[PDB]
Paper text:
We assayed the activity of RhIaaA towards the same set of β-Asp dipeptides used to assess LmIadA and found that it could hydrolyze all of them with no apparent preference towards β-Asp-Arg/Lys. The crystal structure of RhIaaA shows the expected heterotetrameric architecture. This presumably results in minimal interaction between IaaA and the substrate residue bound to Asp by the scissile isopeptide bond, which would enable the active site to accommodate a wide range of β-aspartyl dipeptides.
First, cyanophycinase breaks down the backbone peptide bonds, releasing β-Asp-Arg dipeptides. Two bacterial enzymes are known to have significant β-aspartyl dipeptidase activity: isoaspartyl dipeptidase (IadA), a bacterial zinc metallopeptidase; and isoaspartyl aminopeptidase (IaaA, also called plant-type asparaginase, EcAIII and IadC), a common Ntn-family enzyme with known plant and animal homologs.
Numbering used by the authors:
A (entry chain D): 180 to 313
B (entry chain B): 180 to 315
C (entry chain A): 6 to 164
D (entry chain C): 7 to 162
Amino acid sequence: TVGAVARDAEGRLAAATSTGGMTAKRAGRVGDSPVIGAGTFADDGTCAISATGDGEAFLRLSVAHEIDARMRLRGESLRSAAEAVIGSDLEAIGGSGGLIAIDRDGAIVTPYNCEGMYRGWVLGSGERETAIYE
Amino acid sequence: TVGAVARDAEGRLAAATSTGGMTAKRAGRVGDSPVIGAGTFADDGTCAISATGDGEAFLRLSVAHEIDARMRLRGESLRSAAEAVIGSDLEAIGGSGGLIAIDRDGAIVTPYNCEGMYRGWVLGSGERETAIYENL
Amino acid sequence: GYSLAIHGGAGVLPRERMTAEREAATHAALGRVLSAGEAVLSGGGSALDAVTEAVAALEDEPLFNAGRGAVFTRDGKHEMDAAVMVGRDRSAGAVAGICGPRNPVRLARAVMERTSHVLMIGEGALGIARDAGLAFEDDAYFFTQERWDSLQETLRMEQ
Amino acid sequence: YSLAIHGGAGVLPRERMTAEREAATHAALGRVLSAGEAVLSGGGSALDAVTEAVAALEDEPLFNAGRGAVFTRDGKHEMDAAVMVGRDRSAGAVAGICGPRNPVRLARAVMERTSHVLMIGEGALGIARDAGLAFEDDAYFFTQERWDSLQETLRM
Ligand code: NA
Ligand code: NA
């Protein structure tokens, strides 16, 4: 699974996700990537999210929507919500994976609960990083 | 779209939904019914939900999950949450439809914002009702 | 004690167009569905068995847009979606774009119970139906004249 | 503006990660950031940014989307993709497809050309063709490492 989240010059958000799925998956299996509120999500009032990991766990917990809900209903920060869901909720259901997300103010979080996550970000400053592990 | 939600004697919940889709639908279109957290949902800590209506609106708002979230995060009742999402949120984005739901204590709510919703319930007492419009 | 709630869709006929015969027929169908789910709970069955049997009944009733009496696509075929979910562990199974299985909800359940997946589509989904030994029906079984006329009228009103 | 990307949490284990592969991986991620950066830098939309970024990740054979997509049990590709715009919660998605060079561009074609937020099978491919999107054979998508991953996985 691969994905991207962006915050525009006007503070407008968008998310996109694409995947080949899971190696030796049963033909016809659909994961979280194409299900808005599970693996892909964007609302300019909260955050944009693109997830990667056990697709079934992400579908069952509605991970992307849960983070949007925690921001709206408990007034949590994107970081607090995203960290809680990937760190605790996803662990509790026995799922592995992570998540890139950008809030409406441009805060980027890239939590994961597994060995690593191919990831990167670039700012309007030109400032850039890419990562695999730490 | 059709569906059912149940609570057993121990308070265990389940939900199921089935649909033939939408008249003159585009081949390939998938609505809310088969997407858990949108049209179908069950958690013994909150409620079981089966939705019917404009699938896209239910997918965009994650209606079933929103109701589970409002119960868990704000401590709302199934009625308060379900009625708010179908009555207000679904209306606001211009979607039509409704929802049957049963909470973990057995409270049943069947909100809809449209002409009617073919529906009913039966209790362990034997007590039963069916409805189409607002009356029984 | 146990309880069951059901629906056969929000796409109801407007009250001013609803006849007393159709109203009675509709309440009869809903009554049969409640009995199907009640029998399960009454017999000490699971919430999952209750909603499966109830939804299988709603599929079987031609007044309701699931299984038999399923609406038609633009191209005059049925594409049927279904899901089950159990609240104990949020275990789930679902299918989309299916046609042939008599009771799509029984396939949705077969997915949950036979695979590690919570959603399956196309021939992979039908393969699980066959494995689970679920009943298949011809296109005629699902066909209802009213839905067919609904399509033809709907297509006509797009011209 | 800001852009974040990922190429999956299905990372190669540290003990199998060489300095060359590590460098190759960071290079691929760098090219993706540039694709999305170019859009935002030019005053383009958040939607254009994530579309172009994900199209780049699809094009990179190191990452499990488009080219370098993992294989199913039956040695074929089934690719899922989605876009969503936060302004109006407008969305498009596809599942179980193979052929479109850039599934994410089909996901976007669904959002922009239909009133639907998820489409499957031949209906989804029909929108790709309408949108004039590029189709590719299974050869284009094929990467030896994914094929070997399947063959090793099937040893079970
Ligand atoms: Na039926
Ligand atoms: Na790729």
